[PDB]
Amino acid sequence: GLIEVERKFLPGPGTEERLQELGGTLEYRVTFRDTYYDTPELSLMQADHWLRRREDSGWELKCPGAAGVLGPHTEYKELTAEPTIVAQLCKVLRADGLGAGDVAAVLGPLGLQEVASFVTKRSAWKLVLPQLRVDLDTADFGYAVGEVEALVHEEAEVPTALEKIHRLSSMLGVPAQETAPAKLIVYLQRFRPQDYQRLLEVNS
């Protein structure tokens, strides 16, 4: 139950320089491979849940922290304990008690399948005020996207995190009303358009 509060944006030529000028430091660069999973009907995505396997690492379910109330794609609790990931997968897909301690065992009984696997290179920036993060991601299919991010522990901490993230974003030059899609979504646009389209359709 670590809570990610986030705002994606398309980085510009001056993004990194502005981050430096604000006292930000580049903490690490990292390449990782992620495989995303869903049912044929895309039940998780439609529920704004995001299941992936970080290759060589472990599983993660992103669970929306304020569905309905907040605008979408703003707040996620990141589940990494597999017994909890399973419990929650069964909850959203409406399967019963499976008796499952692990996701791999749960994949077939729940009708979950691989929908994407791709490599990302990340530059991870921190701002040391108690801290904000700015990840700059370039996926292996050419899409560059950024994310201003706060990690909190309490849902009570979320309104403040939002304000902080909104304010950092302005200072980086991101128009109040700009949005940018997740890497996964540009992946579907490019390689599985029929899935991208069904997601825009059913979301109307």
Domain ranges of the chain: 1-204
Query: At how many degrees (to 10) do helices 183-191 and 193-202 cross?
Result: 120
Which residues line the annotated binding site?
A: 4, 6, 8, 52, 54, 62, 122, 135, 147, 149, 183
> How does strand 2-9 pair with strand 144-152?
antiparallel
Q: What is the DSSP string of 17-84?
A: HHHHHTT-EEEEEEEEEEEEEE-TT-HHHHTT-EEEEETTTEEEEEEESSTTTSPSSSEEEEE--HHH
Q: Report how far residue 58's alpha carbon sits from residue 137's, in angstroms, rounded to the nearest whole number.
A: 20
The token pair that represents 164 in the structure block:
């902080």
Q: What phi and psi, each to the nearest 5 degrees, are found at residue 107?
A: -65, -40
Residues ≥6 apart with Cβ < 8 Å to 23: 127, 128
Q: Label residues 4-16 b or e (16+ Cβ within 10 Å = b).
A: bbbbbbebeeebb
In this structure, CATH architecture of domain 1-204: Beta Barrel (2.40)
Q: What resolution in Å is listed for this PDB structure?
A: 2.3
Nearest to 198 by CA among 52, 40, 86, 49: 40
Which residues line the annotated binding site for Mg(2+)?
A: 4, 6, 135, 147, 149
Exposed/middle/buried for residue 21 (C-beta within 10 Å: 0-12, 13-18, 19+): exposed
Which residues line the annotated binding site for substrate?
A: 8, 52, 54, 62, 122, 147, 183
User: One-letter amino acid identity for 137?
Assistant: D
Q: Report how far residue 106's alpha carbon sits from residue 177's, in angstroms, rounded to the nearest whole number.
A: 39
Q: Are the C-beta atoms of residues 95 and 1 closer than 8 Å to each other? A: no
Determine the length of the chain: 204
Residue that the structure tokens 């490599």 belong to: 119
Nearest to 75 by CA among 155, 10, 170: 155
Residue that the structure tokens 């290179």 belong to: 121
Return the SS3 of 7. strand
Q: Label residues 177-189 b or e (16+ Cβ within 10 Å = b).
A: eeebbbbbbbbbb
